[PDB]
Design a protein around this ligand. Structure first.
Ligand SMILES: CCCOCCn1c(=O)c(NCCN2CCOCC2)nc2cnc(-c3ccc(OC)nc3)cc21
Ligand SMILES: [Mg+2]
Ligand SMILES: [Zn+2]
Length: 324
């Protein structure tokens, strides 16, 4: 809608202080859709992206609304609020977490765009489901990071749309570098790619060989940072984390309902509402095997990222208290 764009573009953008976007503890629960969009403008503004890249206000506002409308409203978890929270975590890690100091303006621009765009048009079902139902998307991307390639395709489509070209002011070499970083950052949100590459990151930190001047190490770090932001709701203060965990389970159970109807199978425990009693133990297993070492590794990179680790540890203990 053209009225919604005009409303957003004509609105006063409150400070980062007022919006509380610098806090790792931030919750979007009390915010209206308009407030999330103003928070998003504030993120680009305070990371010096609007001034640096000569972004026109109306074009940025149109792009933010185009990204928001390209998230489905019938998906419990992978909707606009999740993408918005991922970008807010990116902003907090860059500012309060001091990750901004370690990156170029181009890498920050690409990371913020990628965080907001990483789950575009998520259908509320996994890669395995798309492969299982012989989806045209699974065929195009040979069953590898299917959704992630589709999120990037949607990201590119919006970036190329008339009136939405926030990268129009970049030089050719900057534009090509940015799209490359965005693609790798979105593809990194595939947990199978995270498992595949994390060992290398953890060894580089352990051996004190971590060097962001090495282009391979920079790309690897950007990928790890994308996963850290993606999973960040798991580090939130318990009441916030618990409410988001309810949405995560709702979406997995919604998939299980589709699997029973369309595939005639008993879903895996993760996607089986009948086995909802497994939630606390599965949350503990997932935090231990996936989350903890990531937040520890990020804290080793920048000590100011510690609140993400602290929150992750406190939630692990609370889930374990429910599981045992
Ligand atoms: C709450 C729903 C049950 O949750 C059990 C743990 N849980 C899994 O068991 C799992 N298994 C497949 C991934 N696999 C697991 C094996 O290793 C490779 C990757 N995926 C999850 C993906 N997201 C989350 C999650 C939860 C809360 C939150 O914020 C609050 N943010 C993210 C949890 C997950
Ligand atoms: Mg995703
Ligand atoms: Zn995500």
């Amino acid at each position: 809608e053209t009225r919604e764009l005009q409303s957003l573009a004509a609105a006063v953008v409150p400070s980062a202080q007022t919006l509380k976007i610098t806090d790792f503890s931030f919750s979007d629960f009390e915010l209206s859709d308009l407030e999330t969009a103003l928070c998003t403008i504030r993120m680009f503004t305070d990371l010096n992206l609007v001034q640096n890249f000569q972004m026109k206000h109306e074009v940025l506002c149109r792009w933010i609304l185009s990204v928001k409308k390209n998230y489905r409203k019938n998906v419990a978890y992978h909707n606009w609020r999740h993408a918005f929270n991922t970008a807010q975590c990116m902003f907090a890690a860059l500012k309060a977490g001091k990750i901004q100091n370690k990156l170029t303006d181009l890498e920050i621009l690409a990371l913020l765009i990628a965080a907001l765009s990483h789950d575009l048009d998520h259908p509320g079902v996994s890669n395995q489901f798309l492969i299982n139902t012989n989806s045209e998307l699974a065929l195009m991307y040979n069953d590898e990071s299917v959704l992630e390639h589709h999120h990037f395709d949607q990201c590119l489509m919006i970036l190329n749309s008339p009136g939405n070209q926030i990268l129009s002011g970049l030089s050719i070499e900057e534009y090509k570098t940015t799209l490359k970083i965005i693609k790798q950052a979105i593809l990194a949100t595939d947990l199978a790619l995270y498992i595949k590459r994390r060992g290398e990151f953890f060894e580089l930190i352990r051996k004190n060989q971590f060097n962001l001047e090495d282009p391979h190490e920079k790309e690897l770090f950007l990928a790890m940072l994308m996963t850290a932001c993606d999973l960040s709701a798991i580090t939130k203060p318990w009441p916030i984390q618990q409410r988001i965990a309810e949405l995560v389970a709702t979406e997995f159970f919604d998939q299980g309902d589709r699997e029973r109807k369309e595939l005639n199978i008993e879903p895996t425990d993760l996607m089986n509402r009948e086995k909802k009693n497994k939630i606390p133990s599965m949350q503990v297993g997932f935090i231990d095997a996936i989350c903890l070492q990531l937040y520890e590794a990020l804290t080793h990179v920048s000590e100011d990222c510690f609140p993400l680790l602290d929150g992750c540890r406190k939630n692990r203990q609370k889930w374990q208290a429910l599981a045992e």
